Each structure stands twice: as structure tokens, then as C-alpha cells.
Curated annotation (Swiss-Prot):
Record-listed E.C. numbers: 3.8.2.2
Signal peptide: none
Temperature and thermostability: Optimum temperature is 35 degrees Celsius.
Coiled-coil regions listed in the entry: none
Consequence recorded when altering residue 217 to N: 3% increase in activity
Cofactor comment text: Binds 2 calcium ions per subunit.
Record's protein name: Diisopropyl-fluorophosphatase
Co-factor requirement: Ca(2+)
Result after altering residue 285 to L: 21% decrease in activity
Effect listed in the UniProt record for changing residue 285 to N: 97% decrease in activity
Length: 312
């Protein structure tokens, strides 16, 4: 299995649990710090990073009814410059670039209390696929599915329904949507961290998935596994393999990695491409920092990069 060692450049540091790297419609860069605490209680933050200096700015410190958040994953919206944030304590939030935020839902379409979320990914139709490795949100005592299988997957549809699409996962983490060349959503890829597996489903429509299958295998016996992921323009899937010092590269068909990228740190957590470039920003938990490196090709366009009123 070929392994490459590109040059990694430090961007910023001292960000507890550095996660959810994302770019907004204006090109601004954000990351979340889920592990920030205050007096032993969660006090996670959402930060904006100046890429020219590495200087940080906390734009939001989510809290609902006195319960602080654990923001861990992000996606930028298309029709509005706003961020969708998966929070391990608060569920799903919508955060404005000015710092104001709104809680999306306390319960799902079946009336069941929402579970804490970790990452999310939009499909080109505007539906948001979310992983939920935590137990019930906020007032409820914080729990996580690292040992027991209670992790779930949700779909937040364009018509505003929060539907649980599957459950019984052991820490569902990263998530990605594979699209056809015509732009139609085709498959959902979900990372199940401690089991060293990537799972796939065929997407038949909003909140409609079928044919669950083992899609890929994550190497190593180390503690950890697949965390965050994203596709490149050729539909290669790059997967942060937390605890292995590598980012695995899977081909469109999955299976075993076709290549591995060696990182100068043991805990890569999540990644994101800079729009219209081959530059990938990576967060890691060894140093709680953000780095960047050049890939072989550009990233796959994110939903926020597509056009609602586009001809082609
Ligand atoms: Ca994650
Ligand atoms: Ca990403």
C-alpha cells in the first residue's frame, strides 16, 4: 500500500479537540473546539481563524438553558451564509456568522428526544445527513456509544423534518455523500470509529436509504479509527484515521485503502478542502492544532459551492 509524505504547514494551535473545519461562502475559515471546559462543565466554542496570521476569534459559545455545548462538526449552507453545527450535547444548531445561533430540534419526527450529534454532510439536494454517537441531548446525562451500540444516523430534510434513518452504531462519526456525475446523490458513507469499518447505504431519496453494507476497512489495531472524511474531485475518499498517524485514501468502490498519507502527528481528526484548490486543512488531537497540505487534486465541491439558479 503506497504511502506519501507531503509537507504539512502549521496554521494555528491551542484549540482543545480541534474539529469540524469548514469554509463559508465568503471564504472564511472556521473550526470548533468541543473540549473547552469551565469548572468541569462543557463550554465548547466555534472559532473563526484568520488564515494570514493564525489568530483566533470565538464567534459563538453555544448554550441552551444553562447547558454548554460540545460542537464537533460543521457544514455551510447554500441559500444563506450560515453554518450547521453538530453538537454532542445540544444536537443540531444553526449558527450565523455574527455569533447568534438557533437550536434546530429537541425531538425527531417520531417524537423521540434528539441524540447528541458529531458530524454532518449535505447532499446536492440540500438534505443534511448527520451522525449521532451521543445519547440524548443536554438535560440528559451525557453518554457516548464507544462501548455500546446506540449511535444513530439522521437526515434533516429540506422540508424541515428530522428523521432517524438508522441506529445501533458503535460511535458513528464521519459521514460523506457520494454523488453521480449528474449530481444526483447515490451513496451514503458512514464511519463507525472503534469497529474500524466504513459502511455504505444506497440513497433512494430524502431520508430514504437501503442496502446497508460494509464499504471499507480501516487499517490498524490501535485505539481509535476513522473520524472525519471528504471526497476529492475524482471521488476518492480521504479518511482521518485517528490514532494511526495517517489519512487513508479510498477509491470510489471502497474496500481497502489504495494509498495512505503519513501525518507528522498521531491523531488526525477531521479535514476540509479550501474551495477551488488542492489545499486540505486538517485538525488533529495530538497537538490540538490545524495544519494544511497539498493534495494531488481539488476537492469535491461542497453543497455551499453549488448554484440554486444554475443553468448547467
Ligand atoms: Ca468527528
Ligand atoms: Ca470536511
Amino acid at each position: 500500500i503506497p504511502v506519501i509524505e507531503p509537507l504539512f504547514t502549521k496554521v494555528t494551535e491551542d484549540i482543545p479537540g480541534a474539529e469540524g473545519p469548514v469554509f463559508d461562502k465568503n471564504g472564511d475559515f472556521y473550526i470548533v473546539a468541543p473540549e473547552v471546559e469551565v469548572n468541569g462543565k462543557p463550554a465548547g466554542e466555534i472559532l473563526r481563524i484568520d488564515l494570514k496570521t493564525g489568530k483566533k476569534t470565538v464567534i459563538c459559545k453555544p448554550e441552551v438553558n444553562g447547558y454548554g455545548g460540545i460542537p464537533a462538526g460543521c457544514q455551510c449552507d447554500r441559500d444563506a451564509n450560515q453554518l450547521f453545527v453538530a453538537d454532542m450535547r445540544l444536537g443540531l444548531l444553526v449558527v450565523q456568522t455574527d455569533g447568534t445561533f438557533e437550536e434546530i430540534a429537541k425531538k425527531d419526527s417520531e417524537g423521540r428526544r434528539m441524540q447528541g450529534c458529531n458530524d454532518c454532510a449535505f447532499d446536492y439536494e440540500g438534505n443534511l445527513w448527520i451522525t449521532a454517537p451521543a445519547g440524548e441531548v443536554a438535560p440528559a446525562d451525557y453518554t457516548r456509544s464507544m462501548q455500546e451500540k446506540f449511535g444513530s444516523i439522521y437526515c434533516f430534510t429540506t422540508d424541515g423534518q428530522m428523521i432517524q434513518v438508522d441506529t445501533a452504531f458503535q460511535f458513528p462519526n464521519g459521514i460523506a455523500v457520494r454523488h453521480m456525475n449528474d449530481g444526483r446523490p447515490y451513496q451514503l458513507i458512514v464511519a463507525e470509529t472503534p469497529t474500524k469499518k466504513l459502511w455504505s447505504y444506497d440513497i433512494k431519496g430524502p431520508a430514504k436509504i437501503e442496502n446497508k453494507k460494509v464499504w471499507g476497512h480501516i487499517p490498524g489495531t490501535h485505539e481509535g479509527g476513522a473520524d472525519g472524511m471528504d471526497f476529492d474531485e475524482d471521488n476518492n475518499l480521504l479518511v482521518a484515521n485517528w490514532g494511526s498517524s495517517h489519512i487513508e485514501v479510498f477509491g470510489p468502490d471502497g474496500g481497502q485503502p489504495k494509498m495512505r498519507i503519513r501525518c507528522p502527528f498521531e491523531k488526525p481528526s477531521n479535514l476540509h478542502f479550501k474551495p477551488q484548490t488542492k489545499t486540505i486543512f486538517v485538525t488533529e488531537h495530538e497537538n490540538n492544532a490545524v495544519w494544511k497540505f497539498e493534495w494531488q487534486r481539488n476537492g469535491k465541491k461542497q453543497y455551499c459551492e453549488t448554484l440554486k439558479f444554475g443553468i448547467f
